[PDB]
Each structure stands twice: as structure tokens, then as C-alpha cells.
Curated annotation (Swiss-Prot), chain D:
<dbReference type="GO" id="GO:0006352">
    <property type="term" value="P:DNA-templated transcription initiation"/>
</dbReference>
<protein>
    <recommendedName>
        <fullName>DNA-directed RNA polymerase subunit omega</fullName>
        <ecNumber>2.7.7.6</ecNumber>
    </recommendedName>
</protein>
<dbReference type="GO" id="GO:0031564">
    <property type="term" value="P:transcription antitermination"/>
</dbReference>
<dbReference type="GO" id="GO:0090605">
    <property type="term" value="P:submerged biofilm formation"/>
</dbReference>
<dbReference type="GO" id="GO:0003677">
    <property type="term" value="F:DNA binding"/>
</dbReference>
Swiss-Prot record, chain F:
<protein>
    <recommendedName>
        <fullName>DNA-directed RNA polymerase subunit beta'</fullName>
    </recommendedName>
</protein>
<feature type="binding site">
    <location>
        <position position="84"/>
    </location>
    <ligand>
        <name>Zn(2+) 2</name>
    </ligand>
</feature>
<feature type="binding site">
    <location>
        <position position="10"/>
    </location>
    <ligand>
        <name>Zn(2+) 2</name>
    </ligand>
</feature>
<comment type="subunit">
    <text>The RNAP catalytic core consists of 2 alpha, 1 beta, 1 beta' and 1 omega subunit. When a sigma factor is associated with the core the holoenzyme is formed, which can initiate transcription. The rRNA transcription and antitermination complex (rrnTAC) consists of RNAP, NusA, NusB, NusE (rpsJ), NusG, SubB, ribosomal protein S4, DNA and precursor rRNA; S4 is more flexible than other subunits.</text>
</comment>
<comment type="function">
    <text>DNA-dependent RNA polymerase (RNAP) catalyzes the transcription of DNA into RNA using the four ribonucleoside triphosphates as substrates.</text>
</comment>
Swiss-Prot record, chain G:
<comment type="function">
    <text>Resistance to the antibiotics salinamide A, salinamide B, rifampicin, streptolydigin, CBR703, myxopyronin, and lipiarmycin can result from mutations in this protein.</text>
</comment>
<comment type="subunit">
    <text>(Microbial infection) Interacts (via flap domain) with Escherichia phage lambda antitermination protein Q; this interaction renders bacterial RNAP resistant to transcription pausing and allows it to read through termination signals.</text>
</comment>
<comment type="function">
    <text>DNA-dependent RNA polymerase (RNAP) catalyzes the transcription of DNA into RNA using the four ribonucleoside triphosphates as substrates.</text>
</comment>
<comment type="similarity">
    <text>Belongs to the RNA polymerase beta chain family.</text>
</comment>
<protein>
    <recommendedName>
        <fullName>DNA-directed RNA polymerase subunit beta</fullName>
    </recommendedName>
</protein>
Curated annotation (Swiss-Prot), chain H:
<dbReference type="GO" id="GO:0003899">
    <property type="term" value="F:DNA-directed RNA polymerase activity"/>
</dbReference>
<protein>
    <recommendedName>
        <fullName>DNA-directed RNA polymerase subunit alpha</fullName>
        <ecNumber>2.7.7.6</ecNumber>
    </recommendedName>
</protein>
<comment type="similarity">
    <text>Belongs to the RNA polymerase alpha chain family.</text>
</comment>
<feature type="modified residue" description="N6-acetyllysine; by PatZ">
    <location>
        <position position="284"/>
    </location>
</feature>
<dbReference type="GO" id="GO:0048870">
    <property type="term" value="P:cell motility"/>
</dbReference>
Length: 120, 201, 119, 74, 51, 138, 100, 309, 148, 222
């Protein structure tokens, strides 16, 4: 017949693929999937960060613990994946750039603030 | 890949194209680059492998140093159709093959398609080295006779180099025994010189 | 040897409702019967040759009885009798994918058969 | 470096469990924690295990005694 | 010869002998230069009479 | 395929008789390579009575066949795989040493897989197929 | 060209329908890598026509097995060509004969 | 007795522009073959010479296209320019221009003549013109080399210097194209009986026979200089940034200075379970270190082999 | 006629000729036939069939890779291959080739993880083809389930 | 760089015995290979300064086949065994030596009279294997400075071997330095009879080959 429905990846399985390769502990791996699964296909994540802390089901775990795990992923396949609230995404992308860039400090200065005016 | 011949290999070698590599031992090269520090992350190692720099070929040579591989042909009636070999990188797109093991695969050098399998786990490599290695099975499992015996060209050479004549060039004289090779590359004796006395140990 | 199996008997041997049983089972049975208590009640077996393509169906491991023949048929058979395979044949360990007892792994399966009484 | 395996088959004799005894020996060197007794010549641990076994120093009985000693000394 | 060698001397020396035999056979077959021509075969002169 | 080796010695004495094959004119296969691979039985006696050559369990290691050829022995008791002193499989002192290794076969080997395949590999066969007496010797 | 030769190679090549022929062959006026014109003589032409024939060569066109189908000319300038003679040579051809 | 004799370069014969026979009369027995066969292969293996590397034509863009006004398409012109013999003096690279417009064929003589460029074959045709309004203008680059270098090799050699309108061809760089030898009894009779060999060759025309012979002899001597005396008997880890700019919150710097922690290297090859065995630093400090290294140390995941100072 | 045409061209009538050696520089004692024959190129090449892979995309049925010359496809490991391995002792190689790199979904990922890390271990688990088979058998009036 | 060819940077030379040699070179330019190998072999095998025995005036029948005279040693083996006796001469020409010993048994090389112009690499070299202790024997051998290897049929008793080497062979393999991965590497395996170091023999062969051509180079690099 034709039951050879070839499968694929695309930043859900691909994102998860990278998760395993890196050295993340059980508590960290578990958390990783939670945030890597809330990543809307269109671009960034859906829910807020605090949401994620509440959906772990813990009290000893603070934002800091999840911050790292959610910060580590910011540098995976597509630099900028799972960013949340635009600004952080763009900002990160400028971090992996060479510091010997002429408009490095300028861009960064207008990225942290004074964005509204630029938008106009 | 198409099977060719190689006269410089030994009983436990096989010519593996460099282009066929870097795709089969891919997780191995990834781990090598990750342990050597030249690959900070996995995406970095993948990018370096995709660009095919100079360092990945050396890493591949280091990894494939003593990693056994196995060969297989599509028509495999007996168990000799699947043996193991030590892969050696050779520039090209065809897989070389030992002339003596050819009889084992029953080939005629009109190269068809072949198969090259890579053992991943340690025990699989141990089995390929101790049981599937060509230097272990020399006799046939059907009658207990050797099958690695030479073929037409070797037979023809050995038969031409061992032939007696009547009146050769410089026959009759006595020789030491290791001196016959010297007069072969010169003009003082023929290979087919009969009635020659030479001591041997 | 793979053709002269499934011998026939003419005596009861505590199996009077059976004609043409496996050679191994009958032999070992006798070996346990003539020594334990008494060998008066035995069975005088008469070995009868059997075809090759007819012997392949004589397998206790129904799972290794499908590919060699008309699968559906054997399936119905196993639905009527309701037997167990217990994974005794190499092919069965291949279909399941478990470590087969051949060459080296045979040791593993030996150990698994030796320490199975305790757990 | 070693080509043949006959140098180590006669020690075991069976050759059917040679892969098993060589597996636990090389697994230690692969996972980290033990040091090869035989000096290495830039070779993979899969060949080093067999080269150590072919010397008589490594076998099925010695490894069990070593494991028992390491477990009792912990 | 190789059979008797495997029987008596062992496996490794047999493999060594085999590869050396292959090497020297290829070498002497290249050095010889065997070729097949139209003169290398001759019809018997009494063939027409037999026919 | 279900034949596996799981026993060392069968512990039997049935055996078979091995004689060279002869068809009308001469002998096609003498008793030199037909019993060499397997193990001989206990009933092995020299042509001279009250004299033994090899003990009961003796594996021909390509050294006693020459002595058997010197004494010109015709009938040699040899064990085969028709032995019923086994539960599941064949022992090791029965199959002999018909392998590429040269030594006695070990337990766990796949005799059933080597056979039925070593006889099926040669697939080069073709399909669709009293008063006079003359001898060379006497 | 097959220096050895086996026979009607020219015939096979001209009948394989892979080359171009010159119907009503007269005189050649313009030759090009893709266009060839031929001026037919007064005898082999009928009234009501200018008296020219045009052949557009096939250069690098795909086949059923991704094999390029290229053509090459044979006359240089002002050469008399008879009827039925081969004008253009296609793939595996040489001066009108077959060359595999 | 040692010091048998030494050969002398004499009796050079130039029959034609290509054929030339150089002979060496004096030589010792058992040296003619080992000299001729050794010189022949070196002469044929590597030899300097000029050839066509690339051609850029104004009209035609790629070789897989036809042009009007010319009889042949641009496939054979490149093949004829490949075997175009030409010598270059002084410099290596030239951009010689070929321009023509007419009704006849284009040879190798009707080309822009340069001071260093010299054409040895003026009757070498390159194409044929069939139209009155036909014109051909192109620019050829000619350089020097030793052996056969295809175009695929030079494809990757040029990173981005590949505009539209310039195609590349394969270079030969072997201007010898025929060389053979033969030995025969010499004419010397006052001394012991000797022989002599004669180097016969059919050349392309660019290089000279005596110059090629002396160059091959020089190469053979420079190669034997490696046999005269026999033995007279970078890769580093990328992460090497200093311990600074790591955002030491409270006691990270104190722990790095007390425990003799390296710059950035040894901190990555540490496990979370073994790190807690250190004196109390704080879970908040550990999380801060992890968050900081998430951009520099990359989650502290690595197990390297060695760390040199 | 061929011998006459050969003698016409000022060359040996026999056809053989003494060739020299291009490596050592000596002469062959036996003459070798020379000449210009005709050669034909064929369609089956090596740069049109050669392909290799380690990880790609597999089907939804039994989670197996592709067989033909797709973007990344494998080769069928038939029964003639395993019959060769059962008479060797490749049980572990068979065990790693039957489930880990062919059918098992989590198995191939864990194997990839262990090879990237440098552990070189194997976890058998269970292939997907047997589960597909059980699901197809349960579709009829037949009961089958794994026991202990 | 069309005038600078790649030269071997490393030269790994290792020996098994005092006369054995398994020299291994480094990957040179592509193509030299067998040419250089065969050139070195031909130069070190065809002609080389040396010395050996040319004939023997033994006290007996002048014919090559004579009676054993109670020595138990064949007269043909005597002429063969005298061939493998390396002689070292400083500057003297063809010279005649002799020996005379009783029937103590084996006749070694030390039995020859000691001369300042003739030296033996090994005095333990056996000449005769047995003797009946009745009568002595006079060798009356003679050595001559020569080159190459001339047999006894052309020279008109014992064919001399002036070549100080005993066996010579070369083997070409593959070796890589860069992505090119195509270079030739040569390994030279040889065996010397004595009186000359194998490395020193290769050195002398190389010097002879370099000195063989000095005028056709037209004195390059002036």
C-alpha cells in the first residue's frame, strides 16, 4: 500500500533533540520540556515566566532556578528561539555577535530603552 | 558503493571512501569534537562538520583508527558473505576490496552495489574483531578446506616464475641462495634457469 | 536428525490417547518413569520418518510458525487450542527482538534459565 | 595493535564467552575509573582489553575477585 | 601448500604467507607480461584430412 | 534452525560403521576424509587381535589418520548425530571439528544454521537432468 | 569514429531519427551554431516559393534520461549538398556515421 | 678504481620545431638505463610551462550557449585554447585580449601582440566566421604551473571572485608531450668499451630541450640531497577567557581565589554534586553562576582531556 | 588480409611488440599485443548511486527508514544476512541492529546520546513493529497480550 | 612556487641487526617514488667499489671436480663458501694470501695469515667442515679490487662479488599531509654482508648518484 508517511522535526522535536545532547540534570531536564513545549510555532513562547514556576508544582524552586534552564535554551539551533516579549529576543541575538562591531554599543543602548520612538 | 580492487591492502583491510565517511561516523565525530574542546556545543560541532574543515578529517582519522567495520553483499548464501574489515580512508567514491577475499564474496569485478555496516556498541565491535574478522575464518564451514587460496593472476605468476628450461642465460653455476634475487634485476641469470645448485636452510 | 522426529508408539505408556508424539518428550518421559518408581508401564516406540515441509509445522512456539507457512491458518489453530510459546525458538527471540541464545548470548539465556527457579 | 585473536583464545579456550569477558573489561576503561595495566600504544580500549587478556593478566576469574575486593573495600 | 601451512605452522604465519604469496604473484605476473594473440593458437594440419 | 549446542558429552555408545564408497570400477572416496572430522567410537582395534591403537574417546587431529592408513583399516566404529541420548540439541563430542577453527566445537554454536545452508550454498546445479566383468586389480 | 567499422553505421545513424537531413539540397549560404540556410537549385524547386530552406539545430535539450541532445554542423560555407545528405550531426554521430 | 667518468652536454640536434635529440656520449656501463629512465619520468611528471586558465567573452555568458556570427558554439573554442602553446617572460599572469571582425577564420596570430607574450604557433585556428557583421572580443588569462590542474580544484580556490561572464577551463602545464630514450654503443675505443644514450622528444614548442634537461638534472640533484645525509647519524581549547567579567555576586571571586580555580576552564568540567562538597557558597550564588555561564560557560557541560597552562 | 594490412603499415606482421616498463625501466621478456580498439561508456556510474546516512526520517508505520534513494535512505537487511550472523555469534550485533537502530524510537535516541557522550552502551527495550503487529491482530476476534 | 618541490622533512631509519636496514622515508612529491627507488637500487646494485676472491690455486688437481682427499667436504662447496668472505683492504691492489693448519676440525677464517693490508669482518667464518687429521691443506687464495658483479664464465675459477650489499628492495606506499591526500612514500629494505654500514652504503650510493651528473646541471645556483 502506502503507509510510508515520512515524519519530520521543526522546533518542537528539533528543539527537544538538542535538549538531550546537553548536560541537564533530571530536575533541569524536566523543567526544560515545560518551557520547550510552551514555545508557539509562529515564534516565541505563549505563557509568562511565572506560569512556568507554578506549573512545576513546587515551593522550594524559585524563578532563579528556572531562569537558568530557560536562559540556557536561548542559545540553541535558531538563536532567539523561545524569547518572550520581543526585546529579549533581539537583545540576545546581539550578544553572540563579535564585540568588534562598530554599532555594537549604540544598538544595545537603543534596544534596552527608547524603542517606542524607534517604532514610530 | 561500487567495489574495485586493491593490491596494496592486506587480509583485514577495506578501502573506505572519505566521502562515505563523515556521515556514518557522525555521532562519533561529534563526541570527539565535544571531548577535544574544539566543539563548545552540539550546534557548533554540526556546523563545523557541515563546512567540512581541515580538523574534522583529522578527528575522523583518529576515531576510525582501530574501529572495526563489516562488509556485506546482496546475494549472501553462506556465512562467508558477511565479514569484518579494518576501514582505511582512500580518496575516491568506490570501495576497494582485497583480491583474496573476493572469492569469499564470489565477485568478478564488474562492480555491483555493496553494503558497509558499522558496529556501535563495544560488544558488537568485539564480535566483529574475534568472530567476523577475515583473519579468523580461513577455511570453509562446509568441508574444512581453505578458501582464501590465491586466484588466476597469482596462480599465473607463481606458475611463470617456477618453470624449467633447457638452455637458459648463465645456467649451471652454483649459487648461495639469497643471491638469486640480485641477478634477477640484472643480466646474469634467468628466472627459468634449470640445473642450478643453491643451498637452502 | 531433523527428519526422523515425531516417532509413533503402539503401547499405552500413560499416553494411550496419543499416537505420533515428539521423540524427545517420550524419551525423557521414559527416562523419568523407568527409574523413579517402575518401568513396567512403558511404551514401545516405533520411529517413523517424516517429510521436511511437514515437520516445520510441528513447533510448540506458534509465533515461530507463521512466516514458514500460511500465517492465518496457524493463527486460527492457536485460537482454537490456546497454547503458549514461551519463546523457546531462536526465531521467536528474533521476532520479539530479544537477545537470542546463539554463539555468545547463549550464555546469557543459560543463566536466565538457571536462576529462574528463585525468581 | 593486534590482528589475530588466537593469542587470546587459548587462554579462555571456549571462545564463545570471550566477547563477554572482554566486554566488562573494556567497559571500565570506556566509562572511566580504571587504568590499563598493559602500556598503551595509541589504541582503542576494545583492542587494549584483548591485548591485556592475551597476556594472562585479565580473565573471567580475576575480574570477579577484583570487583569483590573493590566492593568490600568500600 | 597453504593447507599444510595452516595445519602445521599456525594461523598468523599462514596469513602472512598468503599475503606475501599474493604480493609476489601480482609482481611476477606484472613483470612477465602475458598476452593472447592470433598466433597463440594453431589449427592441427591433419584436421582437414580427419574431416 | 532450532538446533543449538547445550551439552558437552552425549554419553552414548550407538555409533555407526564407516566404509569407503565403491561403485563398480573403483573407490571414489576412501576412508581418509570421511571419518577424520568426527570422533571415532570405542570399538577401534588394530588388524592384529588383542591390540589397541586409540582409546574410546579419541578425536582425529589429522595425526592418527596417517597411522590408520598405514595399518590399512577398513571398518572403523564412529559415532554420529543419530544419538538419542540428549534432551534438546547435540553434545560437543559428537559433531566433531568440521569448522574453520581446527579445534573441537564449543557449546552454543549454531550447527543447525551452518547446516541446511552449507548444503544450499551450491546453487549451480542444472534442471531436467551381467556376464561382462572386467577388473584392473585382483 | 569507429576505425574498426562493422557495416551500415551511416545508414543506422541516418535512420535513427537523431540527425538532420537536407531535403531539396541546393547551395548553402549561411551557417551558424543553431541555424543553417540552404538555397535550393532551380531544378529541385517549384514555383510560388522563395527557394530557401531553414534548419534550426537542437542545442542541449533534455531527454528521457537527463542526457543532453546536442547537434553540430558539417558544412563550412557555400558547399554543394545533394538530396538526402546529412547536414547536421547530433549526439554520438561523426560526419553522418554512428559513433557510440 | 673509483671515479669512472662524467658525462658532458654535447651534440644537440634540432631537427624540427618539436623533434629534438640530445645525446650524452661519455658514461659508464650500467648507467645509461638508470639515467634515461630516471630523467624521462621526472621530465614528464613535472615541468614548468604556460597555459590557458580562464577566458572571458563579452557576448556569450556560459559555455552551454550558442553565439551568432560564428560557425561553432562555444564548446570547442575552449578545447582549442587549452592546447594553445605560448610563453611568458618576466611575469606570470597576463590578461591578453583577442579581438577580430571579418568573414574569415580566426587564427592565433591575429591577436594583440605583447612584449612578453610570444605565440609559437601562428596557424592555430580558434574558430571560423560566417557573417559579415560578426565580431569576437575576449580576454584570456595565462599563467604558469607544473602539472595537470582541473577547474573543479580552482572552483573552491576562489571564494567569491566569480562574476557572471567568465568561465574557467582545465590547464595542462606539461609542455613536453613526448619523451623517449635509447642506448647504443659509443665511439670511444682508446678506453674501455662504453655506450651512450640519446634523449629524443617531441615537444609542444614553448620550453627548450637543453633547459628542460638541465632543470630535470637540478631537480634530481636537489632530491638526492635528501639522501646524501640521512638524519645526520594551534590546537587549543577555545574557552580561555580570564576569570573576570563573570559577575561575581558575593563569594564567587573568593572561592575562585581560595580554591586556585582557573580562568574559565576548570569551572566547566565540574559536576553539580561535586560542587556542593565545597564550602558553603549558597544556592542563590550557584544559580547566579549557572545563569551567567549560560552565555559564556554554556551550562558547564564539557569533559576535556587535558588543560595545558 | 589482416596480416597483409599489418605488414603494409611497416610493423611486425604477428601483431605483438616488446614493451618496456614505466616504473622500474626494464623490458618485458614476452611481447604484448597492442592496438586501438573501441570502448563504450555505460550509464551505471558511482557518483549517481553512492549514498550513506546515520539518522534521517522514518515512516509512521513501525517507524522504519526509507529503502529507495530518497534524501536519506537505508538498505533492507534480509534473512540471508541474519542467517549468516546466527552462525557466527553476532547475537549482540543482531540485537543492536534489529531494534536499536531500526524500529525503537527512544532506543535510537538514547544510543545517539550515549555515543555523543562517549558511553557505548545499549538498552534493548522493545521495537515498534511487534506493537504494530499486536494492534493489527487485536483488530480481529483474536485476543493476545504480553504476560509475565 | 613552481621551482620548489616538497622534500622529505623526516627520515626514520631503524635496523634490526648490525647489517639489516629498513629505512623509511617521508612523503615526497607525487611521482618520484619508484623512479628514485629503482635509481638508488640500480646504483647500489649494478656498480659499487669492493673486492672479493677471483680464483684459488689449491694444492690439488686443477680440474674443478677432483677427489675429496679425505676432507669430507665437496670441492664445489669449497668454491661457494669462499665467495661469502668479506675482505677489507685500505689501499692495496690484488694480493695473494694463504693458510696452513692441522686437522683440528673446522677451518675458520682466522686460519689465514695476518696481513696489515687484509682484514676479515668475521674470523668465525667456516671454510672447511671436516678433516681426517692426517694431512693439511693449502688454500692460496687471492683478492682483487673491483666493482660490480662479474661471473666466472665471462671472466676468462670462482665468481667474485665486489658489491658489498647482499640484498636490496624498495616498496612504495601512500602517505598524506593535507587535504590533497596523494603523495608517494618509499621504504628501502636491505641486507649487507659486512665491512660497510647499511646507512653508510646508502650515503655512498647517494653521493655517487649526485656526483654522476655534475656538468649537465650547468652549475646551477651560482
Amino acid at each position: 500500500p502506502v503507509y510510508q508517511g515520512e515524519t519530520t522535526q521543526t522546533l518542537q522535536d528539533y528543539l527537544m533533540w538538542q535538549v538531550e545532547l546537553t548536560p541537564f540534570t533530571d530536575t533541569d531536564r524536566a523543567i526544560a520540556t515545560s518551557i520547550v513545549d510552551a514555545v508557539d510555532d509562529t515564534g516565541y513562547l505563549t505563557i509568562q515566566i511565572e506560569d512556568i514556576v507554578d506549573s512545576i508544582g513546587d515551593d522550594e524552586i524559585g524563578l532563579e532556578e528556572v531562569e537558568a534552564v530557560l536562559k540556557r535554551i536561548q542559545r540553541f539551533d535558531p538563536v532567539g528561539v523561545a524569547a518572550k516579549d520581543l526585546r529579549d529576543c533581539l537583545l540576545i541575538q546581539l550578544s553572540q555577535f563579535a564585540k568588534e562591531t562598530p554599532w555594537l554599543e549604540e544598538a544595545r543602548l537603543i534596544i534596552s530603552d527608547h524603542l517606542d520612538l524607534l517604532a514610530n | 558503493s561500487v567495489i574495485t580492487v586493491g593490491p596494496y591492502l592486506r587480509l583485514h583491510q577495506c578501502g573506505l571512501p572519505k566521502k562515505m565517511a563523515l556521515e556514518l561516523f557522525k555521532p562519533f565525530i561529534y563526541g570527539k569534537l565535544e571531548l577535544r574542546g574544539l566543539a563548545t556545543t552540539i550546534k557548533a560541532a554540526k556546523k563545523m562538520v557541515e563546512r567540512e574543515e581541515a580538523v574534522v578529517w583529522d578527528i575522523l582519522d583518529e576515531v576510525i583508527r582501530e574501529h572495526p567495520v563489516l562488509l556485506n553483499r546482496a546475494p549472501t548464501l553462506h556465512r562467508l558473505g558477511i565479514q569484518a574489515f579494518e576501514p582505511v580512508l582512500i580518496e575516491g567514491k568506490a570501495i576497494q576490496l582485497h583480491p583474496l577475499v573476493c572469492a569469499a564474496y564470489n565477485a568478478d569485478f564488474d562492480g555491483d552495489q555493496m553494503a558497509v555496516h558499522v558496529p556501535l556498541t563495544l560488544e558488537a565491535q568485539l564480535e566483529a574483531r574475534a568472530l567476523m574478522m577475515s583473519t579468523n575464518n580461513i577455511l570453509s564451514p562446509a568441508n574444512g578446506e581453505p578458501i582464501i587460496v590465491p586466484s588466476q593472476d597469482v596462480v599465473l605468476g607463481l606458475y611463470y616464475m617456477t618453470r624449467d628450461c633447457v638452455n637458459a642465460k648463465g645456467e649451471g653455476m652454483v649459487l648461495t641462495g639469497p643471491k638469486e634475487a640480485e641477478r634477477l634485476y640484472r643480466s646474469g641469470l634467468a628466472s627459468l634457469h634449470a640445473r642450478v645448485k643453491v643451498r637452502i636452510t | 536428525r531433523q527428519m526422523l522426529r515425531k516417532a509413533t508408539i503402539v503401547n499405552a505408556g500413560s499416553s494411550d490417547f496419543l499416537e505420533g508424539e515428539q521423540v524427545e518428550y517420550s524419551r525423557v518421559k521414559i527416562a523419568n518413569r523407568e527409574l523413579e518408581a517402575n518401568g513396567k508401564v512403558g511404551a514401545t516406540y516405533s520411529r517413523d520418518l517424516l517429510g521436511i515441509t511437514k515437520a516445520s509445522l510441528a513447533t510448540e512456539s506458534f509465533i515461530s510458525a507463521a512466516s514458514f507457512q500460511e500465517t492465518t491458518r496457524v493463527l486460527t489453530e492457536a485460537a482454537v487450542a490456546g497454547k503458549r510459546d514461551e519463546l523457546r525458538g531462536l526465531k521467536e527471540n528474533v521476532i520479539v527482538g530479544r537477545l537470542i541464545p546463539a554463539g555468545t548470548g547463549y550464555a546469557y539465556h543459560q543463566d536466565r534459565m538457571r536462576r529462574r527457579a528463585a525468581g | 595493535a593486534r590482528v589475530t585473536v588466537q593469542d587470546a583464545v587459548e587462554k579462555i579456550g571456549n571462545r564463545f564467552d570471550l566477547v563477554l569477558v572482554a566486554a566488562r573489561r573494556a567497559r571500565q576503561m570506556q566509562v572511566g575509573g580504571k587504568d590499563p595495566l598493559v602500556p598503551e600504544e595509541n589504541d582503542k580500549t576494545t583492542v587494549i582489553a584483548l591485548r591485556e587478556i592475551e597476556e594472562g593478566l585479565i580473565n573471567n576469574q580475576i575480574l570477579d575477585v577484583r570487583e569483590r575486593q573493590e566492593q568490600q573495600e568500600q | 601448500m597453504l593447507n599444510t601451512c595452516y595445519r602445521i605452522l599456525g594461523l598468523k604465519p599462514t596469513v602472512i604467507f598468503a599475503d606475501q604469496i599474493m604480493y609476489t604473484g601480482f609482481a611476477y605476473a606484472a613483470r612477465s607480461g602475458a598476452s593472447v594473440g592470433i598466433d597463440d593458437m594453431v589449427i592441427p594440419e591433419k584436421k582437414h584430412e580427419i574431416i | 534452525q532450532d538446533l543449538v549446542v547445550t551439552e558437552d558429552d552425549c554419553g552414548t555408545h550407538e555409533g555407526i560403521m564407516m566404509t569407503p564408497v565403491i561403485e563398480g570400477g573403483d573407490v571414489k572416496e576412501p576412508l581418509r576424509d570421511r571419518v577424520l572430522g568426527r570422533v571415532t567410537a570405542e570399538d577401534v582395534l588394530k588388524p592384529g587381535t588383542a591390540d589397541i591403537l586409540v582409546p574410546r574417546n579419541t578425536l582425529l587431529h589429522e595425526q592418527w589418520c596417517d597411522l590408520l592408513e598405514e595399518n590399512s583399516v577398513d571398518a572403523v566404529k564412529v559415532r554420529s548425530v543419530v544419538s538419542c541420548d540428549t534432551d534438546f540439541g547435540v553434545c560437543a563430542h559428537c559433531y566433531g571439528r568440521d569448522l574453520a577453527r581446527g579445534h573441537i566445537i564449543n557449546k552454543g554454536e549454531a550447527i543447525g544454521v551452518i547446516a541446511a545452508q552449507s548444503i544450499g550454498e551450491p546453487g549451480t546445479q542444472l534442471t531436467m537432468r551381467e556376464s561382462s566383468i572386467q577388473v584392473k586389480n585382483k | 569514429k569507429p576505425l574498426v567499422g562493422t557495416g551500415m553505421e551511416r545508414a543506422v545513424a541516418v535512420d535513427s531519427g537523431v540527425t538532420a537531413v537536407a531535403k531539396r539540397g541546393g547551395v548553402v549560404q549561411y551557417v551558424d551554431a543553431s541555424r543553417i540556410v540552404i538555397k535550393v537549385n532551380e531544378d529541385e524547386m517549384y514555383p510560388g516559393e522563395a527557394g530557401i530552406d531553414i534548419y534550426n539545430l537542437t542545442k542541449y535539450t533534455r531527454s528521457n534520461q537527463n542526457t543532453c541532445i546536442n547537434q553540430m554542423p558539417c558544412v563550412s560555407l557555400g558547399e554543394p549538398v545533394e538530396r538526402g545528405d546529412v547536414l547536421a550531426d547530433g549526439p554520438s554521430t561523426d560526419l553522418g556515421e554512428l559513433a557510440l | 678504481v673509483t671515479e669512472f667518468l662524467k658525462p658532458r652536454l654535447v651534440d644537440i640536434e634540432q631537427v624540427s620545431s618539436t623533434h629534438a635529440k640530445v645525446t650524452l656520449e661519455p658514461l659508464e656501463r650500467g648507467f645509461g638505463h638508470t639515467l634515461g629512465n630516471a630523467l624521462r619520468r621526472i621530465l614528464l611528471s613535472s615541468m614548468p610551462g604556460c597555459a590557458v586558465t580562464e577566458v572571458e567573452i563579452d557576448g556569450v555568458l556560459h559555455e552551454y550557449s550558442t553565439k551568432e556570427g560564428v560557425q561553432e558554439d562555444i564548446l570547442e573554442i575552449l578545447l582549442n585554447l587549452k592546447g594553445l602553446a605560448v610563453r611568458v617572460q618576466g611575469k606570470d599572469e597576463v590578461i591578453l585580449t583577442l579581438n577580430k571582425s571579418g568573414i574569415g577564420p580566426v587564427t592565433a596570430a591575429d591577436i594583440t601582440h605583447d612584449g612578453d607574450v610570444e605565440i609559437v604557433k601562428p596557424q592555430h585556428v580558434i574558430c571560423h566566421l560566417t557573417d559579415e557583421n560578426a565580431s569576437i572580443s575576449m580576454r584570456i588569462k595565462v599563467q604558469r604551473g607544473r602539472g595537470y590542474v582541473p577547474a573543479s580544484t580552482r572552483i573552491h580556490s576562489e571564494e567569491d571572485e566569480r562574476p557572471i561572464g567568465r568561465l574557467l577551463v582545465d590547464a595542462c602545464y606539461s609542455p613536453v608531450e613526448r619523451i623517449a630514450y635509447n642506448v647504443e654503443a659509443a665511439r670511444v675505443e682508446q678506453r674501455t668499451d662504453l655506450d651512450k644514450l640519446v634523449i629524443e622528444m617531441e615537444t609542444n614548442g614553448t620550453i627548450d630541450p637543453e633547459e628542460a634537461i638541465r632543470r630535470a638534472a637540478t631537480i634530481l640533484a636537489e632530491q638526492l640531497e635528501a639522501f646524501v645525509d640521512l638524519r645526520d647519524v594551534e590546537f587549543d581549547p577555545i574557552l580561555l577567557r580570564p576569570v573576570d567579567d563573570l559577575e561575581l555576586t558575593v563569594r564567587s571571586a573568593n572561592c575562585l581565589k581560595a580554591e586556585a580555580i582557573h580562568y574559565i576552564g576548570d569551572l566547566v568540567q565540574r559536576t553539580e554534586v561535586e560542587l556542593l562538597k565545597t564550602p558553603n557558597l549558597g544556592k542563590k550564588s550557584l544559580t547566579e553562576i549557572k545563569d551567567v555561564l549560560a552565555s559564556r560557560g554554556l551550562s558547564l557541560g564539557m569533559r576535556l582531556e587535558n588543560w595545558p597552562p | 588480409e589482416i596480416k597483409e594490412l599489418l605488414k603494409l603499415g611497416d610493423l611486425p606482421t604477428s601483431g605483438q611488440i616488446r614493451l618496456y616498463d614505466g616504473r622500474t625501466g626494464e623490458q618485458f621478456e614476452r611481447p604484448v599485443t597492442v592496438g586501438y580498439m573501441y570502448m563504450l561508456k555505460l550509464n551505471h556510474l558511482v557518483d549517481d548511486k553512492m549514498h550513506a546516512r546515520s539518522t534521517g526520517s522514518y515512516s509512521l508505520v513501525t517507524q522504519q527508514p526509507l529503502g529507495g534513494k530518497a534524501q536519506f535512505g537505508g538498505q533492507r537487511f534480509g534473512e540471508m544476512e541474519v542467517w549468516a550472523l546466527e552462525a557466527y555469534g553476532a547475537a549482540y550485533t543482531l540485537q543492536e541492529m534489529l531494534t536499536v537502530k531500526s524500529d525503537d524510537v527512544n532506543g535510537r535516541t538514547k544510543m545517539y546520546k550515549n555515543i555523543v557522550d562517549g558511553n557505548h552502551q545499549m538498552e534493548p527495550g522493545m521495537p515498534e513493529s511487534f506493537n504494530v503487529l499486536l494492534k493489527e491482530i487485536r483488530s480481529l476476534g483474536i485476543n493476545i497480550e504480553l504476560e509475565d
